[PDB]
Structures are given as structure tokens and as C-alpha cells.
Design a protein around this nucleic acid. Structure first.
Ligand SMILES: [Mg+2]
Lengths: 51, 519
DNA sequence: CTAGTTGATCTCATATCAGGAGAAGGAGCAGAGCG
DNA sequence: CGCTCTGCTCCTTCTCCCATCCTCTCGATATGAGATCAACTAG
């Protein structure tokens, strides 16, 4: 499950760049690794890298 | 009739039209069919690959060799050349039913019904790469016989959705037509050879470790001699590995046997104007490029901005001062001079561009003159593209043919054009190569020359260097492995600078083993 | 009906030490009990 | 008498907890081309 934005609010800081919650960064890491893994399935790959 | 090894007959009237190299290609295609293996018709642009495929399929259906003769085949090609394939099939082998799976199409009902009809009727279904990606659910349920991919280098990215879709076809008979089946690196070659014959080049990690790193790393200017010899060793290995399944004829070994006119490939180094040079110098002195060089931002913004500036200063749009005025860009000044000269010489010109916006600027400049033009970019409806080409090939009143290299290149025939000018370099050399071979093809009755415009001391010259390095890397494995190292530059991240000028009996086999290790 | 124009949306491609306390597991021994 | 069945203490791991509330300062923390589709936008 991905919590909504109110659980991990992104705040517009003094610098116009938006600030992301810790949960958001962790979810970004999770999405990155999940996408890379899913890529390594649709096209076969060695069991070592998959593990 | 021509009788090949086992049971393959191609009709005499059809065979007679083909040239010597084309029927050699038909022979090779049927040897692949006997081996139940795929292949790449690597013959350069214009040598004739649609005709070789059409003749081979015609002989396969004619010869009556699950499937009796020819089964239901699917031809995946760029959208601009679908009706071209239809026309060639109709003129060369009219017996085939050749339907287009596309919005233009001819069906006027559910597409899935069309795929079903062609599958159960053993017809030829011409489709686009986008449709193969989109309709992969339906396109692969029907046990097709042939999966010819025209301009199959679109499969070069192993992780693209189109590649994964095209690699779902169960049949062994996979063919790629592409006169440049290597464009940026050896990963592309691996992707193509995974499509046609999944096993020869192994898993992508293995291919990288065995070929890509050795062959590429030995082409850098600072390569040690031992590393150069290792790269030579690996390139020879790879050439021997890919020899049976790559058929790549040049327009040097066929030019004498084809009666093509002369060709020139000049490269003009244009000069930035005072205003253009000022904008470029201000940008390379800006803070954004400084942040880029520090790794903080992506390089794309600066790269694209410099390419735009070299094309024309459309960043800061400065009567006769409208947007895109030709005198503010040096390459546009050179193009104006060239167009004047060629028009007074009664010749037809083919004006390419990487950028759609620069194509619009060139179009405005052409209406500013009295030149009669004709434009075709990604926005033009596909259904009108082949008509437009035919128009430019038919009446010589039309002087200049504006094109984007992604749509104007890539398999169309524009032999009516006489001069070709590539206005803007691309990162991929192959884009420029196909764009320049749009004119020098079978049917070109006049001497052609290619003028490739680069701004001297700008990002464009650096891009030209990068693509020369890429072309050398490609030639290292396509034409010969003795390729001279790229020494003109180190190809580092200082392209943000403005530097304006001014049975074997175990002895031959053992000898080969001894010689290869010595390398 | 029926083609041509207009926006949204997606893909893809271009480089370079001065805690402590308690509960849960596993370990080894000790014996009991029965074939 | 061999073999099993607990079971007994004991050492090891591990996980948890460690007053309330309040004030202040200070340092660190891309861009476009092509394709698809859908709404028109009219013929
Ligand atoms: Mg072609």
C-alpha cells in the first residue's frame, strides 16, 4: 500500500523546490528496485542478479 | 525459372528483374529458411531490400515448399513506408493479399477481425511498430510464418516495449531489413541478434563482458597497444560469429554492377554570426552550464539549448526582424546561398532537419523567397505521406523538400531530389546516413551531393566527432576490424565550450588457435 | 457519413567503559520407561 | 539395554524501557518528435 499525500505531505519550502517526506523517498527507492526487478523478469536474467 | 538447392523455385520473369546481388540475397534468405534461422538484410539504404524480400516470399509461395508454401506473414515497418510496401508487393507479386493494420488502412471494421482474416487466409499483414506494441495481445495468437521487420533497428533498445513485443513471435523465421543495424554501440547489435536468433550472442551481460567492453575500450584514443590487439581479437571473433546471419552489401561492391551516378559527401563548417556567437557565448558563460558541469543538473537542458542556438537563436526571438529571420543564423546564410546557386542550376534539393521547430523556421524562410517547397514532418497525416513523396518524385516544379530526419529518412524513396543538405547533425550517425541516402538510390538518374552543415567550434562539431567515433566503432565490426583509432578527440564532458575558429585436419584449426591467442 | 484540426498523454531519444530486566529458543545432561 | 520422551536448569538472543511541561539559538537541508486517441470541426 502507498499512503496518500496527507500521510507524507510535500511542503513548498522557501526555495521553490518542493520538499518530500521521508516516506516518499523510501517509496521512490522501492519503486526503482521493483521496476528494475520486473525488467529482469520480462526478459530472462541470471538468478544471481535476480536474487 | 531459377531452381535452388532442394525445392525452391522463383519465377523466371520475377528472377530476371533482380540484380546479381539481389538474387544472391534471395539465395541467402532461403538458406536461412532451410536452417530455420533469422537474418539481417544489412544492405545499405537504396540497394533494394523490399524487392529481395518480395521476390523471396513470392518464390516461397510459388514453390509450394502447417503451412503449404507461404503462411500468414507480418511485416513491421515505419508508418511512412507501409503503403510503399503495399505498392511494391502489388507491382512485384500481385497474387499476394497485402492488408495494412493501421488507422489509415483499408478495412473499415474491427482491426482484430483483420488480423484474424489475414492469419486464416495466409496473407501479408503490414503493421507499424506502435501497433505491434499496442496489439501484442492479438498479434501473437495466430502462429505467423514470417515476421520481417523493415528498419528493424527500431528494436535496438533491448528494454523498449516495442522490442519486448517483437520478441514474442514464436516463429523462427525472423528477418530485419535495416541498412544500418548498428547505430550507437554493440548493445544494439545484441538486441537485433536476440530478435533474429536468440542464442548466438548470449545473454546481454555475457555479450557486454565478452565483446562490448573489449571492442569499445580499444577504440579510445588512449588505448594501449595490447588493449587494441584484444579489441581486434574480439571484433574478429564477433564478425565470424555474425557472418552467416548478416548480409551487408555496400554501394561500392554493387555500384559498378548497378550504374549509379557519382556521389559527393562534403561537410561544410559554417560560421556563427555575431548575434548567434554572442548568444552562444552568453549561454556557455551562464550559471546553468556551470551547474551542469558540477553534476547538479542534467546535461540535456544545456545540450538542447546549444543545439537550438546553433540551429538558430530561437531562445531570444529578436521590419525584417521576425521570428526565425535567416540572416541571424550562419547555417541559414549558407543554406540561402546554396539554394540560390542550385535554383539557378535547375536542380532539386532535399533539406533535412533534426528539429521540427527549425523545419518551421526553414519553411518560413522558403516562403520568404519564391522557392516552391513541400514539407513532411511527424505532424503530417501518414495517409498523405506516400502521396507527397510521389508528388515530389513526379513534377519537377517543386524545388525543395523539407524533411525531419526521423520521418523523411527511414526507407522512403526520393530519387527525384538531386541535392541533399543535412542542416543539423544528430547524436546518432545513422539518422544522418539514412537521411543522406534518401537521394542516392536505385533510380537516381543524376549526380547527387550531400552537404552536411556544422557550425565550427560549437556543440555541432562535437556531435559530429561523437558520431564519427560511433561510425568507427560500427565499422570495426561491420566492414573490417583494422579500424584506425579515433584520435581527433577524447570525447569528454567539455562540449560546453565555444572555440570558434580564426573436416579440418587439426593443423589449420590449431594454426588459427595459435594466431588468435598471439593477437 | 466523413476527412482535417486541436489538445492531452506516453514513449523514446539525444552525454558524460559506569544498563537492566525479562521472555523465548536451543543445548546438553539426567533420568524414567518401555520395547 | 537401546532408544525415545520429555524435562530441567542454563546460557544466549533479543527486544523493550528509561518524568512533565516550557523558552531560546544555531547548523544543515530538460526538450522535442512521433504515435494514439478523443473531441471537435467543419465538408
Ligand atoms: Mg526499405
Amino acid at each position: 500500500p502507498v499512503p496518500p499525500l496527507s500521510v507524507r505531505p510535500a511542503v513548498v519550502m522557501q526555495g521553490s523546490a518542493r520538499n518530500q517526506d521521508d516516506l516518499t523517498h523510501k517509496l521512490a527507492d522501492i519503486v526503482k528496485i521493483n521496476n528494475q526487478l520486473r525488467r529482469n523478469e520480462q526478459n530472462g536474467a541470471a538468478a544471481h542478479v535476480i536474487a | 525459372d531459377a531452381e535452388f538447392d532442394e525445392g525452391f523455385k522463383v519465377p523466371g520473369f520475377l528472377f530476371k528483374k533482380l540484380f546479381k546481388y539481389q538474387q544472391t540475397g534471395v539465395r541467402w534468405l532461403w538458406e536461412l529458411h532451410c536452417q530455420q534461422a533469422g537474418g539481417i538484410l544489412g544492405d545499405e539504404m537504396g540497394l533494394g531490400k523490399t524487392i529481395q524480400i518480395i521476390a523471396f516470399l513470392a518464390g516461397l509461395s510459388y514453390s509450394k515448399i502447417r503451412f503449404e508454401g507461404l503462411g500468414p506473414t507480418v511485416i513491421v515497418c515505419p508508418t511512412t513506408v507501409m503503403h510503399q510496401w503495399v505498392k511494391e508487393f502489388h507491382t512485384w507479386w500481385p497474387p499476394f493479399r497485402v492488408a495494412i493494420l493501421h488507422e489509415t488502412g483499408s478495412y473499415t471494421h474491427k482491426k482484430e477481425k483483420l488480423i484474424r482474416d489475414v492469419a486464416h487466409c495466409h496473407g501479408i499483414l503490414i503493421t507499424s511498430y506502435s501497433y505491434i506494441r499496442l496489439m501484442q495481445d492479438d498479434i501473437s495468437r495466430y502462429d505467423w510464418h514470417y515476421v520481417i521487420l523493415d528498419e528493424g533497428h527500431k528494436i535496438r533498445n533491448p528494454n523498449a516495449a516495442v522490442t519486448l513485443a517483437c520478441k514474442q513471435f514464436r516463429t523462427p523465421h525472423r528477418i530485419i531489413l535495416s541498412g544500418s543495424p548498428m547505430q550507437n554501440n554493440l548493445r544494439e547489435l545484441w538486441s537485433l541478434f536476440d530478435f533474429i536468433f536468440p542464442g548466438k550472442l548470449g545473454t546481454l551481460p555475457v555479450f557486454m563482458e565478452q565483446f562490448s567492453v573489449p571492442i569499445t575500450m580499444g577504440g579510445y584514443s588512449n588505448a594501449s597497444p595490447v588493449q587494441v590487439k584484444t579489441a581486434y581479437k574480439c571484433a574478429c571473433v564477433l564478425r565470424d560469429t555474425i557472418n552467416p546471419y548478416l548480409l551487408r552489401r555496400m554501394k561500392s561492391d554493387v555500384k559498378m554492377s548497378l550504374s549509379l551516378p557519382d556521389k559527393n559527401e562534403q561537410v561544410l563548417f559554417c560560421r556563427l554570426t555575431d548575434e548567434q556567437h554572442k548568444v552562444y557565448q552568453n549561454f556557455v558563460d551562464s550559471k546553468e552550464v556551470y551547474r551542469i558541469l558540477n553534476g547538479e543538473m542534467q546535461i540535456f537542458s544545456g545540450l538542447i539549448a546549444l543545439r537550438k542556438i546553433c540551429n538558430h537563436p530561437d531562445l531570444f526571438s529578436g521590419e525584417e526582424d521576425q521570428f526565425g529571420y535567416w540572416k541571424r543564423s550562419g547555417k541559414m546564410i549558407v543554406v540561402e546561398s546554396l539554394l540560390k546557386i542550385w535554383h539557378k542550376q535547375g536542380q532539386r534539393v532535399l533539406l533535412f532537419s533534426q528539429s521540427r521547430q527549425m523545419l518551421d523556421i526553414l519553411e518560413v524562410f522558403l516562403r520568404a523567397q519564391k522557392y516552391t517547397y513541400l514539407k513532411m514532418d511527424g505532424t503530417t497525416t501518414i495517409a498523405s505521406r506516400q502521396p507527397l513523396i510521389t508528388r515530389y518524385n513526379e513534377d519537377t516544379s517543386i524545388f525543395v523538400f523539407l524533411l525531419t530526419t526521423r520521418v523523411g529518412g527511414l526507407g522512403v524513396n526520393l530519387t527525384g531530389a538531386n541535392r541533399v543538405v543535412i542542416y543539423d547533425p544528430d547524436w546518432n550517425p545513422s539518422t544522418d546516413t539514412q537521411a543522406r541516402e534518401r537521394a542516392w538510390r536505385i533510380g537516381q538518374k543524376k549526380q547527387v551531393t550531400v552537404y552536411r552543415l556544422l557550425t565550427a567550434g560549437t556543440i555541432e562539431e562535437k556531435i559530429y566527432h561523437r558520431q564519427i567515433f560511433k561510425q568507427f566503432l560500427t565499422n570495426r565490426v561491420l566492414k573490417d576490424p583494422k579500424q584506425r583509432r579515433f584520435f581527433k578527440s577524447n570525447d569528454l564532458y567539455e562540449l560546453f565550450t565555444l572555440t570558434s575558429p580564426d573436416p579440418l585436419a587439426s593443423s589449420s584449426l590449431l594454426a588459427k588457435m595459435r594466431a588468435r591467442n598471439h593477437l
